[PDB]
Design a protein around this ligand. Structure first.
Ligand code: MN
Length: 119
């Protein structure tokens, strides 16, 4: 019954969010309002290169952290400005120094994992 594939193509398939989430109340702007993090799922292809990139035996901790860094649009921990200021070229370390309250860091990770449709 000739199947209609237009729905699974770019000129159509609704695209992934850009979800704002207030990961921490310690980040505020000039007007005292919380600055939420902006997340946006990465691609399945990309999650694949990351897995490969962290396997030898997979470093999950590292794997997930890298996913979170890339799923996080604002702030992006790869930004030169953040690497400079926090004095580390490791975007995952930048994240640990920025989300310096345990719970925030754990929450950020999970939101990212969630934003990518996992569980
Ligand atoms: Mn105000």
């Amino acid at each position: 019954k000739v199947y209609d594939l237009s729905f699974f193509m770019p000129g159509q398939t609704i695209d992934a969010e850009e979800v704002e989430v207030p990961i921490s109340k310690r980040f505020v702007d000039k007007e005292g309002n919380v600055v939420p993090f902006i997340f946006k799922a990465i691609t399945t292809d990309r999650i694949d290169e990351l897995e490969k990139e962290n396997t030898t035996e997979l470093d999950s901790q590292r794997f997930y952290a890298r996913i979170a860094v890339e799923t996080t649009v604002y702030p992006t921990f790869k930004a030169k400005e953040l690497r400079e200021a926090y004095k580390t070229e490791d975007p995952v370390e930048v994240a640990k120094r920025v989300l310096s309250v345990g719970g925030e860091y754990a929450n950020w990770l999970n939101k990212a994992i969630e934003i990518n449709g996992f569980d």
